Design a protein around this ligand. Structure first.
Ligand SMILES: CO[C@@H]1O[C@H](CO)[C@@H](O)[C@H](O)[C@H]1S[C@@H]1O[C@H](CO)[C@@H](O)[C@H](O)[C@H]1O
Ligand SMILES: CC(=O)N[C@@H]1[C@@H](O)[C@H](O)[C@@H](CO)O[C@H]1O
Length: 606
């Protein structure tokens, strides 16, 4: 259509499938393999990107241009990489991915939403959709086009370090929370075929349903381990939400480290090609996890040639290398040159990668929009996170006996109150893992309101607020306090570091709750990524709230404590009596919970 030097794949008016086909037919082997290669920003340079025809970059957890970097610094970084890719012969833009899994969480000043287990407690798919919308804007604020979310693991054992990344042990809650997908990407159009990738445009991002499949089902919740369940249980528990993801046009799927009955997902042709592609009709791209291919072997990385062969023949399209791109490209090129991997496979992989890039408008807007920078940490997004935090909270106890006055909601006016505990004035702890750093961190890591700060912003100006992290019993008894709010729980963790067989909170936690509640009526706020041993906390406390990992907006906690809204959260997991019972999920034969899935006390707004 019309000029001397017309190249159909560059024509924005043409159908995506014709663009894909036109570009693919022009590409060399090196240009194809390049598309299939995702590298860390930490090993990327202009020359590396250009000479290897690199298709994608990511920031892994904590991989940032520098500490405290502004939205514009992020855009400049991404643009700098993109300029190199757009200068190749074919000018195929790279897509940049990041784990924006509760906001754009690696970024200083990004709104930090509650983690997924709290979101499950909300039972509010529309809220999650809205969080998807806001997240897309904050990810685009930083120039990034692709979020490795949602995690749709159905966590079947809370000893897993990633249980907080699952919305529920009940697949139906997980399925309902796939509304994150059209949040992040835009609603699919009315026609729409299930399994087609979709992204509305430059104000949205490509999503990623992960980690396919049964990541939530590993033995003793060991991270990356074996999931021993039969096809019926796979299909009934761990699969359904992937089908909802297909219907909502999720653009990519990330493969699990885990194995299904001794077969490594990263080598499972029957599930990746047979099921995801050929039965669910997924037409987006399938990405590996980080060194997921290396982990096919034991030790990991010990026969990387076999790792490339097995993964690529299994039907993986893009490999998150992420560092040793030269070895990956060399080996894969060898396999293709040797006839071990047919061109038809390469062409399928690249066809899917390009389909997503074209569909989302990446060839029309490869560069960042500086006007979107102000989306980062935008106050409306914070008000949304604050709403979500509040809705996430599950009230487990409100009075030690049935005839006690309920403690919550607390009055905003009182002569003097105590705020205590390790988790009362620690933003990093209240955000938990995947915040600023991979494993999360302690202290004031980003912009936010701690519980203490929230309490001070909420109360009557005549209320004197005292903070003591770990006061002794006497201090409390002598203080003249009307009540205390005490906040304790788990430290931040991510992935294998949080695999935990005992599930008890670190001390001082319990000892502080005991010393405070022994002296004055107390509301205990429990910060955790999962159910933890809670009977001793409960026995000491007048009221106790499971606040999960509520994120940057700690006023979501005080909104419910002071009665501006009523508690509405409901457990999205079974609260066990003992780790010796685990796994123990709703619907099991021996089902003996401390608190069943669905439990939650309520209050009315005052
Ligand atoms: C963020 O990368 C993590 O890095 C450490 C080392 O830096 C690896 O040991 C971990 O296995 C990965 S976890 C993996 O990371 C993907 C990219 O961030 C993420 O999307 C996925 O959900 C994780 O399983
Ligand atoms: C298939 C798989 O992932 N198996 C691993 C096994 O090799 C390892 O010894 C164990 C560590 O506790 O966890 C499990």
């Amino acid at each position: 259509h019309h000029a001397a030097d017309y190249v159909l794949y560059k024509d924005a008016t043409k159908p995506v499938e014709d663009r894909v086909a036109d570009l693919l037919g022009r590409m060399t082997l090196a240009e194809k393999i390049g598309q299939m290669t995702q590298i860390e920003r930490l090993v990327a340079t202009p020359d590396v990107l250009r000479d290897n025809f690199i298709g994608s970059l990511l920031s892994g957890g904590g991989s940032v241009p520098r500490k405290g970097a502004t939205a514009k610094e992020w855009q400049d970084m991404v643009d700098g990489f993109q300029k190199a890719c757009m200068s190749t012969r074919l000018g195929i833009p790279m897509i940049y991915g990041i784990d924006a899994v509760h906001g754009q969480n690696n970024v200083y000043g990004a709104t930090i939403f509650p983690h997924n287990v709290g979101l499950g407690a909300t039972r509010d798919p529309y809220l999650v959709k809205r969080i998807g919308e806001a997240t897309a804007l904050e990810v685009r604020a930083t120039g990034i086009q692709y979020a490795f979310a949602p995690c749709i693991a159905v966590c079947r054992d809370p000893r897993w370090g990633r249980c907080y990344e699952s919305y529920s042990e009940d697949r139906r809650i997980v399925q309902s929370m796939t509304e994150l997908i059209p949040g992040l990407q835009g609603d699919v159009p009315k026609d729409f075929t299930s399994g087609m990738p979709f992204v509305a445009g430059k104000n949205k991002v490509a999503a990623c349903a992960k980690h396919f499949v049964g990541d939530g089902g590993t033995v003793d919740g060991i991270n990356e381990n074996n999931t021993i369940i039969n096809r019926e249980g796979l299909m009934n528990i761990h699969m359904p939400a992937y089908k909802n993801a297909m219907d909502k046009g999720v653009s990519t799927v990330m493969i699990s480290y885990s194995s299904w009955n001794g077969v490594k997902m990263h080598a499972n042709q029957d599930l990746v090609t047979g099921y995801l592609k050929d039965t669910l009709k997924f037409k987006g791209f399938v990405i590996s996890d980080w060194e997921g291919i290396d982990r096919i072997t034991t030790p990991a990385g010990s026969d990387y040639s076999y790792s490339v062969k097995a993964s690529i023949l299994a039907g993986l399209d893009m490999i998150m290398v992420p560092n040793k791109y030269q070895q990956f490209i060399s080996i894969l090129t060898g396999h293709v040159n040797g006839g071990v991997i047919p061109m038809s496979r390469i062409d399928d992989a690249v066809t899917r990668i390009l389909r997503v890039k074209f569909t989302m408008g990446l060839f029309e807007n490869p560069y960042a929009d500086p006007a979107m920078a102000e989306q980062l940490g935008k106050q409306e997004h914070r008000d949304l996170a604050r709403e979500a935090a509040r809705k996430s909270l599950v009230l487990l106890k409100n009075g030690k006996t049935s005839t006690d006055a309920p403690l919550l909601p607390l009055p905003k006016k009182a002569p003097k109150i105590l705020v205590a505990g390790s988790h009362a004035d620690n933003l990093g702890y209240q955000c938990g893992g995947w915040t600023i750093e991979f494993q999360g961190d302690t202290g004031r890591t980003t912009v936010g309101t701690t519980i203490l700060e929230a309490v001070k912003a909420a109360v009557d100006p005549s209320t004197v607020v005292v903070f003591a992290e770990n006061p002794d019993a006497e201090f409390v008894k002598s203080g003249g306090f009307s009540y205390a709010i005490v906040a304790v729980g788990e430290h931040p963790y991510t992935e294998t570091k949080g695999d935990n067989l005992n599930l008890t909170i670190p001390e001082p936690g319990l000892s502080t709750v005991q010393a405070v509640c022994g002296g004055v009526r107390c509301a205990t706020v429990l910060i955790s990524g999962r159910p933890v041993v809670v009977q001793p906390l409960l026995a000491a406390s007048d009221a106790l709230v499971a606040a999960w990992l509520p994120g940057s907006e700690g006023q979501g906690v005080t909104d419910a404590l002071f009665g501006d809204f009523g508690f509405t959260g409901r457990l999205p997991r079974t609260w066990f009596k003992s780790v010796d019972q685990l796994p123990m999920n709703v619907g099991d034969a021996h089902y003996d919970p401390l608190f069943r899935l669905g439990y939650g006390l309520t209050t009315n707004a005052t």
